[PDB]
Amino acid sequence: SNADVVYEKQMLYLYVLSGIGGLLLLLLIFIVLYKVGFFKRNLKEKMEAG
Numbered sequence: 946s947n948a949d950v951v952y953e954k955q956m957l958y959l960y961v962l963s964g965i966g967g968l969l970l971l972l973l974i975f976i977v978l979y980k981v982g983f984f985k986r987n988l989k990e991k992m993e994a995g
Contacts, residue, residue: 978984 975984979989
């Protein structure tokens with residue numbers, strides 16, 4: 946059923962913005978820690994679920 950929310954405010958722009966911001970901060974935080982030496986003092990696993 947299509948309600949009157951698609952024209953009002955799906956409020957999805959918030960979920961999509963929060964998701965893109967967290968991923969970018971995760972990639973930058975991992976590289977910033979591995980470059981400074983933080984992650985350079987441990988045997989990472991580099992996991993990745995499918």
